[PDB]
């Protein structure tokens, strides 16, 4: 099975997937994120951050408090299962993580932690 996804977006900052299924037979999984816009990361930063659905609010809130210089993630946040760098126009990043960190049946969310974005830039992730 495929163990990679490419996440891409609009000129209007709309992204092309809101649900990711990680196949159980994957040993690693890769997310490729690319920025579709014209603005730099301090104005329109994008990242892809994975946590349990339960942890998403805490990660987002603490990330906002941490600020741009920390890519809007609290340092040493063990709630974060995997994530990309915060990227801006013309940039891309990839993250590969260990699928053994996921549990079948647990509910996961991926989201952007740039302030205010997570209500729009988010989706589910499932190990199946």
Can you say whether residue 25 is alpha, beta or left, with left for phi > 0 and alpha for psi between -120 and 50 degrees?
alpha
Nearer CB in complex with Cu ion: 110/114: 114
Answer yes or no whether residue 46 interacts with Cu ion by CB under 5 A.
yes
Helix or strand holding residue 59 (H, E): helix 56-66
Read off the tokens for 22: 């990680």
Nearer CB in complex with Cu ion: 53/120: 120
Rounded CA separation 38/68 (Å): 18
Alpha helices in the chain (DSSP H): 41-44, 56-66
Nearer CB in complex with Cu ion: 73/102: 73
Instruction: Work out which of 56, 121, 125, 127 binds Cu ion, going by CB under 5 A.
Output: 121
Instruction: Work out which of 7, 88, 117, 125 binds Cu ion, going by CB under 5 A.
Output: 117
Answer yes or no whether residue 112 interacts with Cu ion by CB under 5 A.
yes
SS3 128: coil
Show the binding pattern over residues 64-103: x = contacts Cu ion (CB under 5 A), - = does not.
----------------------------------------
Instruction: Work out which of 29, 110, 111, 114 binds Cu ion, going by CB under 5 A.
Output: 114
Rounded CA separation 97/31 (Å): 9
Q: How many CA atoms lie within 13 A of 115 on its CB side?
A: 9
Least CB distance to Cu ion at residue 116 (A): 8
* Interacting residue ranges for Cu ion, rule: CB under 5 A: 46, 112, 114, 117, 121
């Amino acid at each position: 099975a495929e163990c990679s996804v490419d996440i891409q977006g609009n000129d209007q900052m709309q992204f092309n997937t809101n649900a990711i299924t990680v196949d159980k037979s994957c040993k690693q999984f890769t997310v490729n994120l690319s920025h579709p816009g014209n603005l730099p990361k301090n104005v329109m930063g994008e990242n892809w951050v994975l946590s349990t659905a339960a942890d998403m609010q805490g990660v987002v809130t603490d990330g906002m408090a941490s600020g741009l210089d920390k890519d809007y993630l609290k340092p040493d946040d063990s709630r974060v299962i995997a994530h990309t760098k915060l990227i801006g126009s013309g940039e891309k990043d990839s993250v590969t993580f260990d699928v053994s960190k996921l549990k079948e049946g647990e509910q996961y969310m991926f989201f952007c932690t740039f302030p205010g974005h997570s209500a729009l830039h988010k989706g589910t992730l499932t190990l199946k």
